[PDB]
Amino acid sequence: VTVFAGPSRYTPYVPRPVAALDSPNAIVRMAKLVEALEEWADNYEKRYTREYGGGTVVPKVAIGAIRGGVPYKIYRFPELCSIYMDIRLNPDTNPLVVQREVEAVVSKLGLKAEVKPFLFRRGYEAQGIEPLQNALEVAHREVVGRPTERPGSPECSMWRDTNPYNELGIPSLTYGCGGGAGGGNTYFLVDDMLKAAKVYAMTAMDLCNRTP
Amino acid sequence: VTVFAGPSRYTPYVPRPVAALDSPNAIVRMAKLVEALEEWADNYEKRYTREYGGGTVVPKVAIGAIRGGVPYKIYRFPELCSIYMDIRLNPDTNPLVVQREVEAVVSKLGLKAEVKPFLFRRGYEAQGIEPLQNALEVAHREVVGRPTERPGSPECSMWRDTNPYNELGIPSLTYGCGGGAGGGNTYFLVDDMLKAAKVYAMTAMDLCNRTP
Amino acid sequence: MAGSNDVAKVMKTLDGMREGLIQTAVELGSIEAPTGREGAAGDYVYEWMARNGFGPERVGVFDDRFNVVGRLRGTGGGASLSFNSHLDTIMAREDTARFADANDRIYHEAWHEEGRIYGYSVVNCKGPMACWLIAAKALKEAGAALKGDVVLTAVCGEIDCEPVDEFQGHDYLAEDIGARYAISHGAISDYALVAEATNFKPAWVEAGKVFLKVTVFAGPSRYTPYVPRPVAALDSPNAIVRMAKLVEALEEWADNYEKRYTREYGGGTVVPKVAIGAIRGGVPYKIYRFPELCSIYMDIRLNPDTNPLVVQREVEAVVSKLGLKAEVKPFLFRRGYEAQGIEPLQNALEVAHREVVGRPTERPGSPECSMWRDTNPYNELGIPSLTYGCGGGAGGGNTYFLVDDMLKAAKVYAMTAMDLCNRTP
Numbered sequence: 001v002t003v004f005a006g007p008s009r010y011t012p013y014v015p016r017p018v019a020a021l022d023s024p025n026a027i028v029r030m031a032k033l034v035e036a037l038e039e040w041a042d043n044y045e046k047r048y049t050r051e052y053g054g055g056t057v058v059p060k061v062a063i064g065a066i067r068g069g070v071p072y073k074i075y076r077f078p079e080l081c082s083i084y085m086d087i088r089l090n091p092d093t094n095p096l097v098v099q100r101e102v103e104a105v106v107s108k109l110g111l112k113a114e115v116k117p118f119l120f121r122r123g124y125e126a127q128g129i130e131p132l133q134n135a136l137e138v139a140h141r142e143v144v145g146r147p148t149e150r151p152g153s154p155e156c157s158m159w160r161d162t163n164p165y166n167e168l169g170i171p172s173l174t175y176g177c178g179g180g181a182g183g184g185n186t187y188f189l190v191d192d193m194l195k196a197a198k199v200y201a202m203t204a205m206d207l208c209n210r211t212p
Numbered sequence: 213v214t215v216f217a218g219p220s221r222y223t224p225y226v227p228r229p230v231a232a233l234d235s236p237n238a239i240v241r242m243a244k245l246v247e248a249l250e251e252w253a254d255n256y257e258k259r260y261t262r263e264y265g266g267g268t269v270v271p272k273v274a275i276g277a278i279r280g281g282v283p284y285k286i287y288r289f290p291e292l293c294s295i296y297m298d299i300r301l302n303p304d305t306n307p308l309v310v311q312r313e314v315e316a317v318v319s320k321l322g323l324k325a326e327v328k329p330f331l332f333r334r335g336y337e338a339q340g341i342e343p344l345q346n347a348l349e350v351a352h353r354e355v356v357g358r359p360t361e362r363p364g365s366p367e368c369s370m371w372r373d374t375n376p377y378n379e380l381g382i383p384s385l386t387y388g389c390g391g392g393a394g395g396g397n398t399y400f401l402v403d404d405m406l407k408a409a410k411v412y413a414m415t416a417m418d419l420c421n422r423t424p
Numbered sequence: 425m426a427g428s429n430d431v432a433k434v435m436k437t438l439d440g441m442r443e444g445l446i447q448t449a450v451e452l453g454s455i456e457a458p459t460g461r462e463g464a465a466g467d468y469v470y471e472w473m474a475r476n477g478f479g480p481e482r483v484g485v486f487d488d489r490f491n492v493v494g495r496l497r498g499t500g501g502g503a504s505l506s507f508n509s510h511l512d513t514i515m516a517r518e519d520t521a522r523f524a525d526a527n528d529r530i531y532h533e534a535w536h537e538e539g540r541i542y543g544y545s546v547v548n549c550k551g552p553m554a555c556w557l558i559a560a561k562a563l564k565e566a567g568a569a570l571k572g573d574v575v576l577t578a579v580c581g582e583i584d585c586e587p588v589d590e591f592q593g594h595d596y597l598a599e600d601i602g603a604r605y606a607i608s609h610g611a612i613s614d615y616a617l618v619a620e621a622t623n624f625k626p627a628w629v630e631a632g633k634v635f636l637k638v639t640v641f642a643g644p645s646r647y648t649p650y651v652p653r654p655v656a657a658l659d660s661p662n663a664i665v666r667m668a669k670l671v672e673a674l675e676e677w678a679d680n681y682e683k684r685y686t687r688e689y690g691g692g693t694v695v696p697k698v699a700i701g702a703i704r705g706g707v708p709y710k711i712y713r714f715p716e717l718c719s720i721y722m723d724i725r726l727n728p729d730t731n732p733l734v735v736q737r738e739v740e741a742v743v744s745k746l747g748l749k750a751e752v753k754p755f756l757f758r759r760g761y762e763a764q765g766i767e768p769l770q771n772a773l774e775v776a777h778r779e780v781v782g783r784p785t786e787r788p789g790s791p792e793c794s795m796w797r798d799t800n801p802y803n804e805l806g807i808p809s810l811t812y813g814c815g816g817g818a819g820g821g822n823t824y825f826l827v828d829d830m831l832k833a834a835k836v837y838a839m840t841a842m843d844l845c846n847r848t849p
């Protein structure tokens with residue numbers, strides 16, 4: 001998201017006082033856009049929460065980077081300033097819909113901006129997962145002792161490589177020990193790692209002996 | 213000015229909703245510092261305006277650059293974010309005093325920050341300027357036709373190379389045709405350029421024939 | 425003010441760091457680091473400050489010639505004090521053109537024999553540098569209460585090397601990329617103490633300087649079998665010969681220059697001196713024709729109130745009185761300053777000095793007020809600054825410090841900080 005302003009002025013000529021949204025300094029305007037975008041994000045994750053058999057997807061939003069202009073030439077404030085947003089999608093959300101929502105936040109503030117997508121990947125729920133699901137379930141109850149529980153939302157609402165497999169028709173799930181690093185967990189119990197390796201092996205012995 | 217926050221979280225784990233000033237995303241907190249610094253800046257130029265024989269100094273403030281973190285790794289928001297400020301000084305202001313004021317703005321918001329100077333240069337009013345002043349005045353009245361006026365404040369309140377000369381004991385002023393580029397003027401009238409070259413020449417013929 | 429009971433604790437700590445003080449000086453003095461190659465010395469100080477948690481920054485114009493700046497941060501609301509010394513040393517092993525034996529030992533090395541530390545690199549200037557490094561370490565480890573920051577500034581290029589003619593850029597610069605660069609790019613503070621060797625005598629006046637290149641003209645060039653003889657020296661076609669005459673006229677001017685421009689300031693009495701530091705003309709590998717020109721290079725110190733153009737005209741007159749044609753061209757100008765508003769640092773130091781050294785401070789020796797030290801950049805930029813350390817100056821030239829004296833200076837440095845850094849700006 002690049003917000004435009006201007007005209008550029010050498011610091012001894014900058015007009016003051018001026019309303020934030022009218023500032024010639026694009027950094028100043030962006031700061032106002034950021035709090036509007038944070039509230040939009042607060043409501044986004046709730047509006048687009050969606051439950052699937054494979055888990056509940058809670059799609060979140062973060063502002064991951066900002067810049068404008070360059071640190072080694074600061075005697076003129078920037079005519080532009082960019083923000084970089086990570087916006088997670090549930091499998092059923094079109095990226096263009098999200099872009100218009102953001103274009104609208106900007107429009108409500110009366111700002112001139114460019115909202116440009118530079119990454120798009122689709123999320124998927126597995127189709128025909130039952131054989132792997134079952135093979136794993138059997139192994140899990142043997143090694144861990146109880147039925148499996150429904151996954152925590154953050155671990156359903158990220159990017160993991162189940163997506164490429166699913167996209168290409170290889171039914172796929174994710175499973176391992178410990179809390180996610182995004183959490184952030186910083187360790188594994190050696191005993192749990194051993195448990196997992198056992199589950200992985202058992203899963204293989206079931207599944208790899210079926211005829212396709 | 214670097215604002216600190218954290219802890220870093222993978223986008224699917226970001227806590228919402230959170231008050232801006234309590235946000236784990238330093239960019240979010242920074243937006244809030246930017247508003248406080250913009251108000252402080254509106255008042256700074258008035259509080260430190262000061263009138264001298266060589267002109268009236270109106271010292272301004274601009275935020276010239278912002279960044280955090282990097283655009284090519286945005287899946288975790290930054291724990292820090294930096295701002296880069298141009299703060300003009302009248303010849304009589306200690307830089308450390310200004311730093312304390314900026315640290316105070318930060319403190320009033322309950323933020324943890326580093327306010328670190330990376331540039332300091334002094335401004336000067338000329339001493340013992342009269343002979344040059346006089347030669348120039350005379351030449352100016354012959355070529356332009358009326359007396360010189362007191363300069364516009366932005367042209368007194370910037371950085372020009374009169375400062376190194378005055379610092380080193382060489383009485384020095386600035387003088388030319390047209391509006392300043394920080395203005396921003398984008399052309400000169402050839403007639404005005406010719407007038408200046410005449411004023412320069414006459415100034416030289418007077419002054420360089422005076423005894424030191 | 426200085427703490428009552430918190431001083432004794434810090435002093436005790438300093439008594440226990442004596443050998444650490446010694447090794448630091450010796451290791452530091454041992455590094456080959458003449459002006460132009462202080463890189464390695466900077467690297468040492470950076471990792472020393474880093475280990476002791478002063479969070480150093482490299483602040484420089486080149487990646488191999490830089491200043492090192494760290495801080496000992498205070499609780500809040502106090503005055504800042506800089507401690508400053510320089511990383512370069514005087515003699516390079518290269519320099520057979522100014523010294524009779526460029527490769528002595530005292531010129532390049534540093535060792536602890538007897539409870540003394542020998543070496544020009546220690547007198548100027550790693551001895552005093554070690555002192556405040558240790559003082560800072562003591563303050564930090566003793567948990568001394570300081571409201572203000574202590575800024576630790578180790579600079580490059582203090583020694584008066586300057587570029588001229590075909591000698592340009594990285595290899596020949598000094599002061600332009602040293603302290604004044606560091607201060608201009610962050611190393612600012614309320615007051616500054618420059619640790620160089622005075623003898624426990626504070627100085628807060630220093631001299632400026634103007635360097636003149638004087639080229640005398642003659643001619644016409646003649647192949648040696650054609651040179652006209654006999655001719656009065658001042659009429660010689662050989663510019664070398666005429667210069668020889670100008671040289672004794674300039675030496676006479678110099679004997680009187682220093683006396684005429686002696687001036688007494690509160691910060692010390694300035695006796696500004698003159699030396700001819702170099703001569704050349706023309707080239708050694710083509711001597712079959714004498715030169716039509718010959719240049720001389722003069723170091724002329726200025727008191728704080730003398731315009732360099734005034735001095736240039738005096739030299740031009742000397743040339744004129746001999747009936748010679750010459751170009752007197754300046755290729756270096758720096759101003760000297762007396763500290764303004766120095767009293768708080770003066771007082772903090774005075775009290776400390778009397779606790780440790782035992783007697784009042786005396787007025788400084790003239791050469792130490794009439795030289796170039798890094799007080800000039802600090803004062804030029806509005807940071808009141810004085811000089812103070814142990815031992816005799818290398819310009820003397822002294823060649824050693826007493827360890828007992830170094831321990832004393834480090835103690836004086838600490839007390840000064842404990843006083844000053846708790847005053848309100």
Ligand SMILES: O=C(O)c1cc([N+](=O)[O-])ccc1O
Nearest residue numbers: 159160180181182222287288
């Ligand atoms: O699987 C994860 O937890 C995970 C976390 C991050 N991250 O916190 O940035 C990135 C990729 C991951 O797979």
Ligand SMILES: O=C(O)c1cc([N+](=O)[O-])ccc1O
Nearest residue numbers: 010075371372392393394395
């Ligand atoms: O002299 C000026 O007007 C001037 C303007 C800028 N600027 O607008 O960035 C910089 C240097 C200047 O001298």
Ligand SMILES: O=C(O)c1cc([N+](=O)[O-])ccc1O
Nearest residue numbers: 514548583584620817818819
């Ligand atoms: O500080 C000094 O004593 C000093 C001496 C010389 N020198 O003797 O050539 C040069 C630079 C100095 O700072």
Ligand SMILES: [Mn+2]
Nearest residue numbers: 548549582620
């Ligand atoms: Mn020195």
